[PDB]
């Protein structure tokens, strides 16, 4: 029901991240959130690979994935 949104943002990432490394770092970040289940670790690493206007779209992009609860805590941790 909301799979297109993932591939849509993910697709945007590839467009804004031609390199493979940036993608490698992002992969580790996503795997961390799934394993650790902590949005605090995601915010930190996220900025590292999303500290640029061009990379910013990833911060807001991945968010939608995060559950409502983690969304509130995630949004709080983020500059907004």
């Amino acid at each position: 029901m909301d799979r297109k949104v993932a591939r849509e943002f993910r697709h945007k990432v590839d467009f804004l991240i031609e390199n493979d490394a940036e993608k490698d770092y992002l992969y580790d970040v996503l795997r961390m959130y799934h394993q650790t289940m902590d949005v605090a670790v995601l915010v930190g690493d996220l900025k590292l690979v999303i500290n640029e206007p061009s990379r910013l779209p990833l911060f807001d992009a991945i968010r939608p994935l995060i559950p409502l609860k983690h969304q509130v805590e995630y949004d709080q941790l983020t500059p907004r």
Partner: peptide
Amino acid sequence: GSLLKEVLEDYLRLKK
């Protein structure tokens, strides 16, 4: 439905 997991699988598949 685990959206995060969906994106991870999407990438792994987009790799090949």
